[PDB]
Design a binder for this molecule. Structure first.
Ligand SMILES: [K+]
Ligand SMILES: [K+]
Ligand SMILES: [K+]
Ligand SMILES: [K+]
Length: 116
């Protein structure tokens, strides 16, 4: 709302991004999928996303609401489910990350709501 301040909001997103990365204990989503090694990746995936790209977007002031930040985290998970077969560790790690990251985002959303 009209009382929310830029700096406190961005510090909340920086802490939330660190918490979401802490849940990716495999470091699967740290960096963009390398297209030289996975050349069919963009056949399936229209908007690649990863935690490094999210950190760049955050520090470029591209996240000015909570839902745009959440949408990019959800894209990390949804892209992994789309590309990888259900029997893979990567697919099951993305399902887990959706669960654990959802809990991180619920606590962070309460802090955003208290900024008015
Ligand atoms: K990590
Ligand atoms: K992936
Ligand atoms: K599953
Ligand atoms: K899911």
């Amino acid at each position: 709302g009209m009382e929310m301040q830029l700096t406190p909001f961005l510090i909340l997103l920086r802490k939330t991004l660190e918490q979401l990365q802490e849940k990716d204990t495999g470091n699967i989503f740290s960096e963009p999928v390398p297209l030289s090694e996975v050349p069919d990746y963009l056949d399936h995936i229209k908007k690649p996303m990863d935690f490094f790209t999210m950190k760049q977007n955050l520090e470029a002031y591209r996240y000015l609401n909570f839902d745009d930040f959440e949408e990019d985290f959800n894209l990390i998970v949804s892209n992994c489910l789309k590309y990888n077969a259900k029997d893979t560790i990567f697919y099951r790690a993305a399902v887990r990350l959706r669960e654990q990251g959802g809990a991180v985002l619920r606590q962070a959303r309460r802090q955003a709501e208290k900024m008015g």
